[PDB]
């Protein structure tokens, strides 16, 4: 019979290329110890010193005395960008691409006798191998499990793609009776003839056996045989939705005849369902209308250790179900069996797609390599109930716009991406026609103009409207309007988001703050849409999760560590009715700060998610009244004046109380500098900025530039600059990435006293902007040139002690080429 | 006037050794570009690629034109371990020390009419500067600021030892009147002889002037003059505790006697406070008994980018003056004066000590430096009213009683260490005696024999009782005998404490599982005795915070590298705040629950509550558990589990007010006995030979403690409980592999009929190579498992297999051959 297992374990690992290291008399004995799965780069110092190359993974096979007439099939569940497989020195074969499996049965070029070596040979850099952009362009490595299997000597086909070999579908459903097909390959490896019995068992989602099916054949020494047997249409059949997953087990033997005996076994999950993308009235399944609640997901676990990413991937779901998704677009996701396995036994509808993306170059053997990505992506997943669709292009124009203009300049790049379109497009339906096709696109409309929206069943919109560029309310229009031309092309938008650091936040969120609150304004906006709209089958937001790339990806509910952002919980009020939702959405902002009048209480605003009609927010148990719901959020002025306060919610739902609660720390900020509000203090301010940033150096809060009025402090002068660049030489990257420009000074009034002065300089503008300063109409920089210094985004601090022997602190700027500014500014009383 | 600022940016630098790259025409075009503070190797592996050697720091210097007629000191706050600084390729000096500053007068060096290129020479790798053992050996890099500072030609003299150059002391210090000395020196770096107004101004703590002091001096060309001025004696000082932290600011100013134009200024901080230290009776602090609660602290700072940790040193303080601290013991600190000034101005007594540590060996010029550091320390810190003793030494037979056992081999070393501790309680009571010294010792009695305690004002001993062997109990009792046997060494508890790990917890906690609930167990043993035994002066628990190091148990903090509190942070809180009411629920470090479930009845699993209200109440989920009765500042709810995302709420009353604390954590039960359908979506682990819960860092899977099997139910068969302290390749998840069930039998499974996928965890920690075979129910999924000879000893192995059960349970047995069978783990979930 068959068994299978790892052999994760016990592998040497050497970064470059190597003398026949595949040779089994090699030593090895200095390369490193390493534990599969094994990811190549998760060290990022950029381009620089991320390792495109060639790497060696050596393991020894001491085979097992109960296998010696067993043939042996070797799998890899994934390895990027592509692998050679080596048994004793000998070439098994290769591989392209790093999202599917492969598997070879290398029971000729193994003995029983002396161990057997396995070598791999990796490598990340191949251009002719999906991604060709992207973040994933060089994601290298063994970072999935290599499987050992033995079976007997007649077998189901373990080498047809790296699949099972099998193929469950359902070629008709409806609520009163459905059909079924299994279907597959078995193969004779032994010299002679056999006699067999092939025995199809199906059991309902109680555990009881419905139906079974027997046939029985006969095959040739070497013979493939393939199989196709029908089965007793299901009367009254269990129907399977993300809320009603119900599977039925299709466990497959494989009986020699003669003797009774069993010899290879093959269970597979399969369920009835039927659905329709209706271009004007959306998203249909088992005959009754359903909103599409959809997340992206790639991989994206966190770097715990040396080489390797965690393995989160189950819990990780659990994740995405209790917020009540029901839909997951996949990609670039290796061994994405793992998560579609729990979209089929918890429930979640889903598509998967080979990762196409940006341009399509003129590089040779890519259109062939994609084909065969394509083919085994389907067939290695063809079983899984919950795909109800397979994409294998996404955003297919993005960079083919920027670099190519003329007609003239895009002709023959819009002829060679049509025709890789149309190809796999055929490929698809070849290869699965109980499923629908399906091509994202950018938001532009030359997706349209140039054809490639013609060739899928359904289209998705990646829809950034109030993010890069636009208004929050250019959603609606571009969708409406997308509908009015082509109704009959039906849309889901196939990507939405906006970036979100916990260190930012704001009172007045604009886009590309990065601000919490904004992320929650956008998505507060986009929800409704998606809900509400009928012609909109549903959507699936940017990625679940929050990842890093050497080479902007902040746009996700959860935070890297997995930790749910507060706007998590926005997503689960709306679509989880089942159970009360009650979230204090500040665990994103427990280091609160703001400026005060003398001791007048200080209002910042504290926003609850929920699905109860109204709630209450205490604070250090002072009712601050009942507020109704509307779009599943409400916001409360809190008054912050104890330091450390603690706010607490409840309300009511379905009879029963449902509270929350949760401790935060506040500080206070004097708005009028006298001598005993100013010891212990370090006025932090986040010049030209209307965000609090809150520092990985310092843990200080930032404060948001103010303008100076008499008795207080502040800016005079200038107006706000935003960049976007990496800012190098500091953790505090958004304090840096927004000055105040035109800046003629600063003044704070303080007494007389020494004081601490910082100030914060990024040089932004790639005539040379060179000034000088002034406090107190003394000069301490004659000429400061950001740029000739440090370089442009560079960051620069500077401190200076200052004897202070009026009653404000008049820093002033010194224009002498281009322009005066300044990113920060940090005073300290010192005596 | 004086200008004093930072020159930290523009710096381009080079790992390792390079020549002529002191001088200015070189090229620098292909360097790293830096911002200081720069720490070296914020990267971990031991002695492989953790740097050692030589190291390379290149600015350009733009001179400002109205500096031409002032004098260029520049001072490097601290590098580690040594600094040579080239002006021009010129080679003005070196320094020896990573945790003082330097200070140079660079103006002949430098030129008015071109740039100039400023070069520093940084070597780590220096077996000769103190320290030369632990995480501190090769702490390298220029990791503090540096300053450029331009004065007129009289100035105070900045070149002293790199410190401010002024020196204040109280002589006489009582409730009735206080006396002050002001001492300095005032340096004439000018051609021509100078005449000067030199004036002492003394502010109150409340700001106003208590005085003004001026006098006359006249210096010739090139002279240093030493002035001393006392002043009007204090009547009634208001006295400073760190509870009234009262601070007169002394501002000494320098004119020119003919136009009175100001020259230099330097400010300081004194304060009038006494006390002493009995061997009986414990300490005092302006004549009343005072308890030291104290802490240590050392350089703390995560790596938070490439070359780049925090500067969180003015937060970090915040957090120990909240705790209610009022001790502080200070050492491996580069620039500690930033923490004194908290120590001065918000209030916590210091000691500070230069960090010779662990055996004195014999090398050419450490004594020499260890004297040079020990002053150069005092001298930049002697105005700091909060510092109250001074030390220098730590453990310093610790590793010379391992490395040696013959008393031949040992009396040169003892001899030799001897020699260096008179040589420096000598040379502090030189520098300073205004304060009190002391030593760290180790928990030997070695330190007696040997004399070492006969040798500073006060000891200190760091008992590790209760953690490294013996029991709780062993602590009083070695304080106890001590005290009994040299009733005239005042003592400090100078460190104490346990190791914990957030991802570990246990219900019946002991020493080394790293439990959190141990950690508390230990500190709730520590804490009263340190309170309530009077020969004891106080004490410093272990460095106030977790970090790790890079080389060879660095966890025993209060507050993790993250700058969170632990819960036992609030252990803390609850005895030393009286001010403040506390009431912390002591679960932050444990808010993934998961825990054994009979049918639908609930999981019992404890909740602790530190605070010192005198009773609370608990509710879970709004369900009152009952009030309970504080005693030792903490009070422990059994609590019921249910829902998987329960509230816990308490409330009690201090002060007449009312006082609460909420949180919501995370529950997951786990089916004590399996059926078809508790296995839905079930992944149940198992931390085998282990009594902990461990929360895992690569799946979030609360791996739940090992049970014995019982029909019906599961667990393991046969086998003792085993142990490592080793860390553990290839993983991490370390303790999960670090605990085994050693000569294991078997692991049982009553579950039904199906297709499970069984992972197991082994690692061999047992220096035949065990080997053994592995069956499920009659089939051999292993035949000849050795995880020392395929892997490696102390190599991480998981082994995964799908299995198909036609049984109703799943019998794991294990097959002996060579050595014994063993299992680090175990995790069990159903497919089909
Ligand atoms: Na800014
Ligand atoms: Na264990």
């Given at each position: 019979?068959?068994?299978?297992?790892?052999?994760?374990?016990?592998?040497?690992?050497?970064?470059?290329?190597?003398?026949?290291?595949?040779?089994?008399?090699?030593?090895?004995?200095?390369?490193?110890?390493?534990?599969?799965?094994?990811?190549?780069?998760?060290?990022?110092?950029?381009?620089?010193?991320?390792?495109?190359?060639?790497?060696?993974?050596?393991?020894?096979?001491?085979?097992?005395?109960?296998?010696?007439?067993?043939?042996?099939?070797?799998?890899?569940?994934?390895?990027?960008?592509?692998?050679?497989?080596?048994?004793?020195?000998?070439?098994?074969?290769?591989?392209?691409?790093?999202?599917?499996?492969?598997?070879?049965?290398?029971?000729?070029?193994?003995?029983?006798?002396?161990?057997?070596?396995?070598?791999?040979?990796?490598?990340?850099?191949?251009?002719?191998?999906?991604?060709?952009?992207?973040?994933?362009?060089?994601?290298?490595?063994?970072?999935?499990?290599?499987?050992?299997?033995?079976?007997?000597?007649?077998?189901?086909?373990?080498?047809?793609?790296?699949?099972?070999?099998?193929?469950?579908?359902?070629?008709?459903?409806?609520?009163?009776?459905?059909?079924?097909?299994?279907?597959?390959?078995?193969?004779?490896?032994?010299?002679?003839?056999?006699?067999?019995?092939?025995?199809?068992?199906?059991?309902?989602?109680?555990?009881?056996?419905?139906?079974?099916?027997?046939?029985?054949?006969?095959?040739?020494?070497?013979?493939?045989?393939?199989?196709?047997?029908?089965?007793?249409?299901?009367?009254?059949?269990?129907?399977?939705?993300?809320?009603?997953?119900?599977?039925?087990?299709?466990?497959?033997?494989?009986?020699?005849?003669?003797?009774?005996?069993?010899?290879?076994?093959?269970?597979?999950?399969?369920?009835?369902?039927?659905?329709?993308?209706?271009?004007?009235?959306?998203?249909?399944?088992?005959?009754?209308?359903?909103?599409?609640?959809?997340?992206?997901?790639?991989?994206?676990?966190?770097?715990?250790?040396?080489?390797?990413?965690?393995?989160?991937?189950?819990?990780?779901?659990?994740?995405?179900?209790?917020?009540?998704?029901?839909?997951?677009?996949?990609?670039?996701?290796?061994?994405?069996?793992?998560?579609?396995?729990?979209?089929?036994?918890?429930?979640?509808?889903?598509?998967?797609?080979?990762?196409?993306?940006?341009?399509?170059?003129?590089?040779?053997?890519?259109?062939?390599?994609?084909?065969?990505?394509?083919?085994?992506?389907?067939?290695?997943?063809?079983?899984?109930?919950?795909?109800?669709?397979?994409?294998?292009?996404?955003?297919?124009?993005?960079?083919?716009?920027?670099?190519?203009?003329?007609?003239?300049?895009?002709?023959?790049?819009?002829?060679?991406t049509l025709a890789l379109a149309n190809r796999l497009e055929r490929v698809l339906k070849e290869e699965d026609s109980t499923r629908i096709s399906t091509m994202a696109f950018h938001g532009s409309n030359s997706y349209n103009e140039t054809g490639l929206s013609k060739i899928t069943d359904i289209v998705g919109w990646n829809l950034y409207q109030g993010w890069y560029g636009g208004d929050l309310t250019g959603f609606?229009?571009?969708?409406?309007?997308?509908?009015?031309?082509?109704?009959?092309?039906?849309?889901?938008?196939?990507?939405?988001?906006?970036?979100?650091?916990?260190?930012?936040?704001?009172?007045?969120?604009?886009?590309?703050?990065?601000?919490?609150?904004?992320?929650?304004?956008?998505?507060?906006?986009?929800?409704?849409?998606?809900?509400?709209?009928?012609?909109?089958?549903?959507?699936?937001?940017?990625?679940?999760?929050?990842?890093?790339?050497?080479?902007?990806?902040?746009?996700?509910?959860?935070?890297?560590?997995?930790?749910?952002?507060?706007?998590?919980?926005?997503?689960?009020?709306?679509?989880?009715?089942?159970?009360?939702?009650?979230?204090?959405?500040?665990?994103?902002?427990?280091?609160?700060?703001?400026?005060?009048?003398?001791?007048?209480?200080?209002?910042?605003?504290?926003?609850?998610?929920?699905?109860?009609?109204?709630?209450?927010?205490?604070?250090?148990?002072?009712?601050?009244?009942?507020?109704?719901?509307?779009?599943?959020?409400?916001?409360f002025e809190v008054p912050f004046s104890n330091r450390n306060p603690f706010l607490f919610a409840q309300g009511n739902y379905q009879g029963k109380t449902v509270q929350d609660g949760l401790r935060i720390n506040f500080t206070p900020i004097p708005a009028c500098l006298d001598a005993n509000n100013l010891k212990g203090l370090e006025l932090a301010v986040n010049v030209g900025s209307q965000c609090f940033f809150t520092?990985?150096?310092?843990?200080?809060?930032?404060?948001?530039?103010?303008?100076?009025?008499?008795?207080?402090?502040?800016?005079?002068?200038?107006?706000?600059?935003?960049?976007?660049?990496?800012?190098?030489?500091?953790?505090?990257?958004?304090?840096?990435?927004?000055?105040?420009?035109?800046?003629?000074?600063?003044?704070?009034?303080?007494?007389?006293?020494?004081?601490?002065?910082?100030?914060?300089?990024?040089?932004?503008?790639?005539?040379?902007?060179?000034?000088?300063?002034?406090?107190?109409?003394?000069?301490?920089?004659?000429?400061?040139?950001?740029?000739?210094?440090?370089?442009?985004?560079?960051?620069?601090?500077?401190?200076?002690?200052?004897?202070?022997?009026?009653?404000?602190?008049?820093?002033?700027?010194?224009?002498?080429?281009?322009?005066?500014?300044?990113?920060?500014?940090?005073?300290?009383?010192?005596?």
């Open positions: 019979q068959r068994q299978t297992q790892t052999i994760n374990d016990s592998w040497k690992f050497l970064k470059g290329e190597c003398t026949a290291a595949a040779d089994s008399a090699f030593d090895d004995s200095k390369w490193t110890s390493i534990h599969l799965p094994h990811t190549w780069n998760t060290d990022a110092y950029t381009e620089k010193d991320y390792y495109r190359g060639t790497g060696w993974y050596r393991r020894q096979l001491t085979l097992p005395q109960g296998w010696k007439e067993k043939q042996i099939i070797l799998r890899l569940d994934a390895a990027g960008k592509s692998a050679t497989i080596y048994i004793n020195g000998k070439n098994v074969g290769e591989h392209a691409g790093g999202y599917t499996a492969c598997s070879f049965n290398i029971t000729p070029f193994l003995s029983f006798d002396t161990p057997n070596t396995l070598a791999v040979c990796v490598d990340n850099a191949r251009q002719d191998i999906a991604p060709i952009s992207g973040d994933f362009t060089f994601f290298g490595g063994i970072y999935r499990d290599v499987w050992l299997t033995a079976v007997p000597n007649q077998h189901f086909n373990l080498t047809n793609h790296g699949s099972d070999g099998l193929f469950i579908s359902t070629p008709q459903v409806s609520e009163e009776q459905a059909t079924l097909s299994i279907r597959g390959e078995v193969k004779n490896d032994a010299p002679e003839k056999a006699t067999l019995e092939l025995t199809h068992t199906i059991y309902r989602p109680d555990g009881t056996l419905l139906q079974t099916l027997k046939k029985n054949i006969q095959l040739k020494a070497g013979e493939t045989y393939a199989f196709s047997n029908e089965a007793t249409p299901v009367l009254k059949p269990e129907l399977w939705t993300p809320e009603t997953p119900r599977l039925y087990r299709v466990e497959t033997t494989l009986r020699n005849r003669k003797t009774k005996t069993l010899l290879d076994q093959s269970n597979h999950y399969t369920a009835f369902r039927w659905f329709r993308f209706d271009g004007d009235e959306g998203f249909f399944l088992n005959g009754k209308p359903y909103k599409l609640r959809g997340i992206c997901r790639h991989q994206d676990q966190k770097p715990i250790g040396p080489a390797l990413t965690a393995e989160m991937h189950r819990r990780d779901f659990l994740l995405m179900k209790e917020m009540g998704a029901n839909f997951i677009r996949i990609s670039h996701y290796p061994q994405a069996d793992a998560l579609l396995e729990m979209c089929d036994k918890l429930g979640m509808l889903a598509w998967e797609e080979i990762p196409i993306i940006d341009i399509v170059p003129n590089t040779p053997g890519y259109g062939d390599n994609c084909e065969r990505n394509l083919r085994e992506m389907i067939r290695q997943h063809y079983n899984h109930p919950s795909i109800i669709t397979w994409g294998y292009m996404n955003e297919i124009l993005l960079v083919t716009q920027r670099k190519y203009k003329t007609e003239a300049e895009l002709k023959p790049v819009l002829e060679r609606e229009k571009f969708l409406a309007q997308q509908h009015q031309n082509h109704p009959t092309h039906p849309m889901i938008v196939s990507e939405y988001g906006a970036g979100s650091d916990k260190r930012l936040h704001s009172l007045h969120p604009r886009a590309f703050d990065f601000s919490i609150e904004y992320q929650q304004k956008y998505l507060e906006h986009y929800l409704p849409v998606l809900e509400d709209t009928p012609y909109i089958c549903g959507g699936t937001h940017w990625n679940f999760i929050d990842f890093s790339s050497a080479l902007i990806n902040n746009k996700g509910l959860v935070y890297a560590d997995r930790t749910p952002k507060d706007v998590y919980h926005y997503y689960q009020a709306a679509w989880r009715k089942d159970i009360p939702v009650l979230h204090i959405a500040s665990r994103d902002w427990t280091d609160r700060a703001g400026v005060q009048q003398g001791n007048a209480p200080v209002y910042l605003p504290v926003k609850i998610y929920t699905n109860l009609s109204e709630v209450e927010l205490f604070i250090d148990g002072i009712s601050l009244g009942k507020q109704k719901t509307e779009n599943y959020t409400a916001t520092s990985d150096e310092s843990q200080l809060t930032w404060l948001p530039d103010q303008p100076y009025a008499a008795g207080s402090w502040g800016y005079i002068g200038g107006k706000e600059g935003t960049a976007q660049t990496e800012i190098q030489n500091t953790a505090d990257g958004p304090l840096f990435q927004t000055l105040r420009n035109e800046i003629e000074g600063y003044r704070f009034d303080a007494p007389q006293g020494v004081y601490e002065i910082e100030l914060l300089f990024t040089d932004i503008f790639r005539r040379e902007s060179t000034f000088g300063i002034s406090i107190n109409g003394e000069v301490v920089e004659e000429s400061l040139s950001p740029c000739k210094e440090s370089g442009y985004f560079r960051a620069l601090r500077k401190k200076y002690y200052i004897t202070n022997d009026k009653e404000y602190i008049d820093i002033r700027f010194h224009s002498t080429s281009g322009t005066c500014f300044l990113n920060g500014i940090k005073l300290r009383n010192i005596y």
